[PDB]
Nucleic acid binder design. Sequence first.
RNA 1: GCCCGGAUAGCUCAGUCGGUAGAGCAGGGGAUUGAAAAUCCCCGUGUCCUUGGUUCGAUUCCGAGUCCGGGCACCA
RNA 2: GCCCGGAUAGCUCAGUCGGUAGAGCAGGGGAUUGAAAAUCCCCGUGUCCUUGGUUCGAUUCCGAGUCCGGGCACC
RNA 3: GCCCGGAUAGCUCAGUCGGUAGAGCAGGGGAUUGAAAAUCCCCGUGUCCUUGGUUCGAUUCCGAGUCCGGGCACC
RNA 4: GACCGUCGUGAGACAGGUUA
RNA 5: GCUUGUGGCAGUCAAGCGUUCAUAGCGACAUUGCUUUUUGAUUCUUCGAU
RNA 6: AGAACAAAAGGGUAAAAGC
RNA 7: CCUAAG
RNA 8: GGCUGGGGCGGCAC
RNA 9: GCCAGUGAAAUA
RNA 10: GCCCAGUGCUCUGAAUGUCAAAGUGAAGAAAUUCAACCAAGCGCGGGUAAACGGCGGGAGUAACUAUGACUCUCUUAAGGUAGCCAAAUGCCUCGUCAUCUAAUUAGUGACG
RNA 11: GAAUGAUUAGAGGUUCCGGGGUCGAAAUGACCUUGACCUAUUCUCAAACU
RNA 12: CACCGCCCGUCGCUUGUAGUAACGAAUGGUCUGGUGAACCUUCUGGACUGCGACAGCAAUGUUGCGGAAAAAUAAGUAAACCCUACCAUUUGGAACAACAAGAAGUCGUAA
RNA 13: GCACGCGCGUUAC
RNA 14: GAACCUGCGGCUUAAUUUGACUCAACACGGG
RNA 15: GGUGGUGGUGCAUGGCCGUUC
RNA 16: UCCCU
RNA 17: ACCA
RNA 18: CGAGGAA
RNA 19: GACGAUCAGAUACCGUC
RNA 20: GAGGUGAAAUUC
RNA 21: GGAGGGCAAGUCAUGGUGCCAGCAGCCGCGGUAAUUCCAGCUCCAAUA
Lengths: 140, 95, 125, 213, 68, 141, 192, 208
Amino acid sequence: EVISYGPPNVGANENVFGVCHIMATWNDTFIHVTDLSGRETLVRVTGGMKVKADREESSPYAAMQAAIDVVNRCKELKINALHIKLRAKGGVETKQPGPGAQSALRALARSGMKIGRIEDVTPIPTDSTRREGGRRGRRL
Amino acid sequence: VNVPKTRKTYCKGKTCRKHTQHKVTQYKAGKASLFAQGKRRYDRKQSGFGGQTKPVFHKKAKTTKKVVLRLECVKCKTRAQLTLKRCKHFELGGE
Amino acid sequence: FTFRGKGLEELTALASGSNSEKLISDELAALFDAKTRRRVKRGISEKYAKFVNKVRRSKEKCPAGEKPVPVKTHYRSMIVIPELVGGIVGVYNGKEFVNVEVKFDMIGKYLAEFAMTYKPTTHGK
Amino acid sequence: ITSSQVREHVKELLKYSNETKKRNFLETVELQVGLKNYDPQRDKRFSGSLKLPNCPRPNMSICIFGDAFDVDRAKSCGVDAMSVDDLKKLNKNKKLIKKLSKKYNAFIASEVLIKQVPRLLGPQLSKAGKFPTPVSHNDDLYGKVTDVRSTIKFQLKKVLCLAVAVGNVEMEEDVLVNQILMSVNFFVSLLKKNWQNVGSLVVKSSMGPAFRL
Amino acid sequence: TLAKAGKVRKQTPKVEKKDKPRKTPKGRSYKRILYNRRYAPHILATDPKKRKSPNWHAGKKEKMDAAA
Amino acid sequence: GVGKPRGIRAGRKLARHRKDQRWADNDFNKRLLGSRWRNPFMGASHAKGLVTEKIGIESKQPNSAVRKCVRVLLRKNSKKIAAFVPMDGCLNFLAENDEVLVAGLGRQGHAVGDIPGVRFKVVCVKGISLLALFKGKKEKR
Amino acid sequence: TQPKLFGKWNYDEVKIQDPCFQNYIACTTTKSQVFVPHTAGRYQVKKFRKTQCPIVERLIGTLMFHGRNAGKKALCIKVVKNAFEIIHLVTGRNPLEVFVGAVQNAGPREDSTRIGTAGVVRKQAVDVAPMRRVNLAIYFIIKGCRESAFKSMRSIAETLADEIINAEKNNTQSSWAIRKKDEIEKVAKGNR
Amino acid sequence: RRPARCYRYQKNKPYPKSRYNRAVPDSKIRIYDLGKKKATVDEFPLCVHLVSNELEQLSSEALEAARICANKYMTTVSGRDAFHLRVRVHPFHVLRINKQGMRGAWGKPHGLAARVDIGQIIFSVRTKDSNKDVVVEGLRRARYKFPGQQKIILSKKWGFTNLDRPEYLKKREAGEVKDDGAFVKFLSKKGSLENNIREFPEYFAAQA
RNA sequence: GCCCGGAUAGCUCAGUCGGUAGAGCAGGGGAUUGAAAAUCCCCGUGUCCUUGGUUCGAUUCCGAGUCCGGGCACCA
RNA sequence: GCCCGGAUAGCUCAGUCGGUAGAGCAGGGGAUUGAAAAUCCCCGUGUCCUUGGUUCGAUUCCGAGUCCGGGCACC
RNA sequence: GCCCGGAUAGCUCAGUCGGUAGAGCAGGGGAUUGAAAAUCCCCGUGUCCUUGGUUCGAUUCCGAGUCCGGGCACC
RNA sequence: GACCGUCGUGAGACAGGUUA
RNA sequence: GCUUGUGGCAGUCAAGCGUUCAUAGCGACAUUGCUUUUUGAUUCUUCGAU
RNA sequence: AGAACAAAAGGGUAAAAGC
RNA sequence: CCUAAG
RNA sequence: GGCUGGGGCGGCAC
RNA sequence: GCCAGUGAAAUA
RNA sequence: GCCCAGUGCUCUGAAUGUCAAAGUGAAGAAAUUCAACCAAGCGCGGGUAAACGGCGGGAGUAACUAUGACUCUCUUAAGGUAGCCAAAUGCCUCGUCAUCUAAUUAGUGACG
RNA sequence: GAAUGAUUAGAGGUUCCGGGGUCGAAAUGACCUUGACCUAUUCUCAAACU
RNA sequence: CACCGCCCGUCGCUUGUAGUAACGAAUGGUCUGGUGAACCUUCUGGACUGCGACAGCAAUGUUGCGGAAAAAUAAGUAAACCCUACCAUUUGGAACAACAAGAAGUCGUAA
RNA sequence: GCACGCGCGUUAC
RNA sequence: GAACCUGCGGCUUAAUUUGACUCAACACGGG
RNA sequence: GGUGGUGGUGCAUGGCCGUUC
RNA sequence: UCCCU
RNA sequence: ACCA
RNA sequence: CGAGGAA
RNA sequence: GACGAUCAGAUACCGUC
RNA sequence: GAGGUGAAAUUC
RNA sequence: GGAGGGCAAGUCAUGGUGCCAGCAGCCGCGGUAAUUCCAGCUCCAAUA
C-alpha cells in the first residue's frame, strides 16, 4: 500500500497541524503549507500553476484549484488541520486582501480540511516609503 | 559531366584481356600521418625554432582540380585502373 | 443572288388591284400584323393619302440619275405602303427632318421606326 | 555459454546414463544448433560443409513444386504439391503456402511467380519454413537434393534444423565440444562477422542434457 | 482701386431745385412763423400728447391738404 | 481711518502724495512729458506738405472699402504722413506733388473707427479748401 | 372515455417525473388532452398564458416559422402528425413520452449574460429558468430540422422525427439541438 | 578642325579603314543627288558638270559645304524642281592623328576624305536647257568653296544627262535600253507584234 | 583540415530504445465586436533531405551521399 | 573623362530560382455622422527603363544605351 | 572673356523620334449662400525671344548673335 | 617644431587651412 | 627644343545685319593662314649641380 | 543555300558536317 | 561547357 | 610582383 | 510442444 | 547630451560545443592507430564610453509666394544635445549684410 | 547602272499590306496622300566582300 | 447664431511699426591744458609845444622847466581758437532680423 | 435618354 | 447581395419642366 | 394703358401642411 | 430595464 | 430605445 | 439567384 | 533619460527601471 | 510562478 | 451745419448707388425694396 510520511501517529481524535500561509495580490495568489515553525516547506500552489492567461493568475477559480490541489496533497502528508496566516503585500501596498483570498480559504474548508486559528499578517509599517507612482499616482 | 557508372571500355589486366564492364568510381584521398618518410624526416625545425620548408606553400591555385576516374572490371578480376578526365566542375551519370 | 419578301410586283398589283381605293386594299390587310390591321380596319386618315401621291411624283419625275426629291412629313405614325418603297422621305423627329431611303424590308413597319427621336448616350466624367 | 563448460556438455556429459554400468550396444551423439533463424529467404546460408555429417534421422518430405512438371519433380522420391489452379485462389495464404512449403527440411523447387509474391505465394512462407532457396533447381530436385536428403554435411534451412557428429561411444573431450563446433561451419559462422548470432540451444546424445547454462 | 474714385457722384442724375416760389423770410420773421406753426396756442390747445411731428408733412401732397 | 493721513501737521505728506499718485493719469502724464511736441506736427494744429502719392487703404472689421489717402511730406518736420482725403470725389483734385494742409481726426491718436493707421485729414489742395473744390459753384484749377 | 392524440396516443401514457417541468408543460391537464393540436387558443395574452398550451400546439407553432414558406398551421399540424407516426414506428413508444423527454433534455440549464463595460465584452454565470428552458428546447429542436431539411429529400416530418428521438437520448452527435444545449452550458461554464 | 594639313597627297597608300580599321569617325556627306530626284530622264536634260583637275583629297566636311551652298542656290533661285546635284565624288580613306613619350605611333582615324583624280568629275549636276546659267553660275559657288578645283564644264553623253548622245537619244527617239540581242521582245517596241519579228528573227538565224 | 548537432506542416520545431507523425504560430471558416485586439470553437499540408542494408515491418537503427548549422586548430 | 548603384502599381519602397510579382499610402463605391475627419466593410492596378541576343519560355541571364544617384583623378 | 542654361497669355511655368500649344492665378459669366468665402464648370488672351538654314510645313530639329541666370580668372 | 579640421586601428597621409 | 591641336591674331566667298543699300561700319555658313608671353603634346640637352 | 552546326571570328559542311 | 553536344 | 609615353590609380598587348 | 498457429513478433 | 553593435577592457555568470601534454579504454604481435573523457583559453551571457571611438540618410506635407514645429517612410548602437563659426576647422569662397575706407582677396559684427 | 554587305536621291509602278481624305462611311466599288517590294536610274564604300 | 460651441500656441501669410539701450551727427553749455586780439592801469618814451635866462632889435639858436602825441612795458579784465573730459536738447540708421495687428492659412488640440 | 452612385419596393433561390 | 419596378443624383441630350434633401427629400408634389 | 401668364422671389406674404409632439 | 439611441 |  | 459583407 | 504599452500621432495621462 | 494592466507588455 | 440712436428734427413707401462710392465724434450705416452714402423735397439747430 501507500507509504505516507506524516509522523508515525494516527487517531481520528488526534489533530495534525499545518500552517497555511496565503498571500492574495490583485495579480497573483499564493497558498503555502508548512510546519508550525515554518522552516520546512511542504505544499505550494499558486494561481499561475492553475491557468493560462496572465490576467487570471489571480481569479476565484485559480484559488479553488490551487486550494483543492493542496488538500489532496495534505491528506497524504496525513495532516487534517491548518493554521491560517493571511496576508496581502502589506509593505507600502493596498493592505487589503486580494480576491483569491476568501476564495482559497473557502475551498480548503469545503474539501474537508479542519481549520486552526486564523491570523492576518499583512505587514503594516510604522513609517512608510514613497509608494507606487508619485505625487499623483496611477492616472486614468 | 555525366559519365555512366560501368561501361565496356575494352581494357585488360591482364589474365583477362578484351572487354569487360567496369564499375568506375572516381578516386578519393588517403591519410599519412606518422608513416610517410615525408614525415620520418620532415619531423624537424632543427629545433628550438623553425619555419618549415621552402615549398610551404601559399601560391595561387587554378580553381579546377581533376576527375580521378577509377575504372575497374570484375571479370578481369583486376585491377582498379585509373584514368584522367580534366574539366571541373562536374559529376557522375545524369543524364 | 438575293430576292425580296413576297414579290415587290405582286403587291403593286395587290395594292393597286381592281379596287385601288383605300391606300391599303383589304389585300395588303392579310399581310400586316394585328396592330397595323387594327388601325387600317379601324380609321386611317386621308392626309396619309395625299402624302402618298407626293412620293409618287418624286419617284417618276426624277431621272434614273437616282436623285429623289425628298418628301417631308410629320406623319411618323404612317405604316410604309408597298408603293412607298424606293423614295426618300424626310421624317421629322423632334429637331429636323430625317431622310431615309425606303427599302422593301421596312414595309408593314411604322415610318417612325427610322427617324431616331433621341441620340442615345456616349459617356465620360 | 561459449565457455570452459563446453566440455562439460561434451566430456563430462558423455557417460551420464540412468542405471548401471554403461550398456553393451552402439552410441549416438551430436551437437544441436540451427540454420540462421533469419527468415529462410533473404540471407542465412551459402555453401561449405563443417562437418557435422548426417542426413535425415526421421522422414525428409520437404518441398518442391510449380508446374505439371514439378510433380515428377517429386515422384521418384516424395515431396509436397503447389498445385496449378491454386496460385489464383488457394496455393498460399497462411496454412496454404505452408502446406507446400511447410514440412521440416526447407524447399528444393524452382521458380515461377510474376507479379504475385509480396503477400501470398512466395511471400507468406519465408520464416515459416521456405521462400525459394538454393537447391540447384534446373535439372530437378535430387542431385541438389544431396543438399536435401543425404550427405550432408548439414543443409540448414527453413525453420532452424541442422546436424552434427564426430565419434561413437567414448573417446572425445576437447575435440568433443571442439567436435561439436567442428560440427558447425556456415551455421556457426561465415563471411562478414558471424562468430555468434543467437542466445542458447541444447545438446546431448541420449544421456542427459549437456550445457547447464 | 483708384480710377474707381467718386464712382457714386458721377453716376448720380443731377436733379434741380424748385426755384423758390416766393421767398423765405429771414429774421424775427422766420422765428415768428415757426412760433405760429407750432407753439401758437391752437396747437398747445389740443393734447400735448396727441400733437403732430414738425415734419410728418414730409412734403406729402395728399396729407398736406388733409391737414390744411 | 482710511489710507490718507488726517494730520494738521502732515500737509507735506498729502502734498507729495498727490503730486506722485497723480502720474497715474494719462492726460497728465501726456502733456507733462512733452509728448505733444514729438508728434509729426510738433504740437501744431495744422501742417503744410507735398503729396508723395495717392494710395488707398482697406477698411477694417465689419466694413470693407477702399479709402482714399495721400502720403504727404510735412515741410519743416519732414515726415511721412498718412492722410485721409475726405468726401466722395475728393482724391480727384489732389494732383501728385501739390501742396496740402492737414489736420487730425478726433483727438490725436485713434483714427476714425474704420481707418487703419491713418491719423490725418486733408483740407487744402494748392491752398484751396477741399470743401470749396467739392461744390461746383465754389472753386477749381 | 380518454381522448387519444391524433386518435391514437394516450396522454396518461406519460408523467412528468421532475418537479421543475410539472407546471411548465401540458401533458398533465384534463383540458390538455386534445385530439387535435389546433386550438386557436388565446395564449400569449397574460404574462404566462403560454403555459396552458398543449405542448404540441407549441411545437407546431415554433415549426411554421420560416418566412415565406410558413405562417400556415393547417399544414404544420401534419408535419407534426406524420413525424409522430414515424417516431413510433422506430421506438414504438408513445411519441409524446418521447417528444416530452426531448423537451426536458434539449433545454440549457445555464447561459451567459453579455454585460460589456466600455468596449470590453464580459459575461456572467446565469441559471436558465423553466419557461425559458422549455421554450429554448423546442425552438432549438425545430431550429435544427430545417438545417438539414433544406435541399434534402429528407422531409421535415422525417427530419423532425429523427430529431425528437436523439434529442431524448442526449446523443451529442445526432441533434443540432443538444449540441448547443451542451455548448451553451460549456461556453457559459467558461464565462462564469 | 585641325586645318587641311592632313590634306591632299598620299603619305599612306589608302587606309579605307573598313574591316581592319574599326573606328572610322562616321562620314560627313551622307547626301548625294540632293535635288529634283525621281526625275524624268527626259525633261531636265543638258547637264553641266564640275571636274577637278588635281589628284587631291577633297576632304570630308568639305564635300559637305559643297552640298550645302550647292543646294542653297540651286534651289534659292530655281526651285526644288530645278536641281538634282549628283554628289559624284564620295569619301573613303580614313585619315589619322598622333599622340613612352615619342616612341612609335600609328594614327587613330580622324576624318574621311576622297581622292579627286586630276580629271575626275565631282559634285556634278544636271538640268533643263532653260536652267543653264542658273546651274552654271551656281556651281561657281563651290569652286570657291572646297580646296579648289574646278571645271564648271558643259557636257553630253552616254546619257547621264541630255546628253550628247544628243544626236543619240535624239535618235533613240524610237526605243530605250536594249535593243541588245534579238529574241524575247518584252520591251514593247512596236508594232504587231511578236509574229512579224519572230518571222524575220529566225529568218536569218536560219541563214546559218 | 578535424571534431560535435541537425535535415519533419508554408514558418519554428517535437518525436516509440522498430508498430501513430505531433505541438506552437502563420493561413482559413464561424461566433463576438463602435474600432482593433485579445478571446472562443473547427480545420488545413507531410518520400519525416537522398541511397541502400537490419527487421515481419523502421520518423526511429547502422553505412554512405549532399546540404545547412556549431564549434576548434593551423596557414609556406 | 575612369570604377560603382539602381529603376517594378499613382507614390515610397519589397521579390524571383528563368514560369509566379508585391505590400504600405493613395484611390473608387457603400457604412457610421446632422456634416466633415477618424474608423468599418468591398474593390481595381502593373512593356518590372529602352534595347537587341540566348532560351521552349526573360522583370530576372548576357551585350549596347538613356536617366537619377554616389566614389576616385595621386607623385 | 570662354562652358552649360531659361526665353511660351495679364505674372510664375511643360511639349510623338516636329505636324496640336497648356494647366495655375489674375479674370469676367455662372452653379452655390440668407449674402459671402471656399469650391466646380465655362470665356478670353500669343509668330512658344530676333536672325539665318533642314522639311511639304519648325514654337519644337539645327547654327550665330541676344537678355537675364549657376560653375573657370600674374607670380 | 606646433594647431585644427578630414582619411587611417597605428605609424602617419592631405597640391586643405594655420603659425615659427 | 621641335609641333600648334588648344589660345591669340589676321584672310578669302558673300547669305546676312546695317529700317532704303551685301563691304561706310560689320559679316553665317564654308575655306586659306600667321603667331610662340597660354595651354597641350614630346623627352633631345642638362640630377657624374640648373 | 539567305539555316544549322555549344559556345568569339573566320574556315569550312546539303542524300551532309545540318534534322 | 557535352553520356552526348562522343 | 611585374609590363607603364616618367612614378601612381587604372588596363593586361604578363 | 510441434505438423495446426494468429498477431506488429510464438516458448520447454 | 545620446549611443556597449564594432575594438578593447572587465564578473560569481552559460542547462550545454571545442579545447595540449601527461593519465584512461579499445585493437594488433608491436611499432603503432582509433577512442572517451580533459585546465586554461575560445565561443555564449552581463557591465563598461572623464575607454578607442562613434552622432544617418528621401518623400509627401497652402491658405500670393517660398516654406516645417507635421506625419509617411527605408533604415545602423545611437542619427549632434546644449552650446559655436566662413573661426587656426567652410569645399565652392574673394561666402551674403552690414561696419571701418576716397578704395578693402584685410580687419570686426552679424546670418547657418 | 556585277556577287555580297553597306549606304544617297528623287523618278516609273497601269503594284500590294495601311495611317490620312474624297462621291466618301460599315464585305462601298473608285480614286486618293506617307510607308511597304519591284522596275530602268543616282550618290558614295569595305582588314575580316568581288 | 447656444459643442457640428468657444479657443491656444508653433510656423506661415496678409497689412503694417520703428520703441528702450548704445553709437553717429547737429545745436548749446561746462571742465582740462595752452595760444591770445583788444582795452583800463603801470613804468617807461618824449616828436610837438608853452614859459624864463643867454647868443641878435628880429626869423633863428643854447640850455633850465612844464604840458604832451607815436613807440615800448609789466601785472590785469579777457574776446576768439585749439586740445582734454562731461552734460543737455534734438535728429539718424540698413539686408536678415524684430515688433504689431488679423484670419474657415498649416499641425495638433491646451483651457 | 445611359458608364455609373443612392432610396422605397416587386419576384426568388 | 439578385433580376426587374419606381423615385433622387450624375452624365448625356435640340430638350431631357421643375420642387424638395438628416430624421422634418427620393412611388412625396395624389408625379 | 390693360388683360393673361405652371414665369421670379416661401427669406415680402396670406391660406394650408410637415416638424419639434 | 436604462446599458445603446 | 434596447433587452427576448 | 444556391438565402446575401460593413451596416 | 532608457524602456515597455496606448494611440492615426504620444519622447503624454498607465506600467518597468 | 511572481509582478504589473482595462487587457498585456518589457521586467524577476 | 444736420434730420437712425446719443443729439432738436422725415412713418417721404422719392430718384441714383449695391459692403462699391462714400458716411460715421462713439454705437454703427452700405452687399437691389439703404430712415447715416449721392441728391430732391420737407423739416431742425445756432443765426451775421
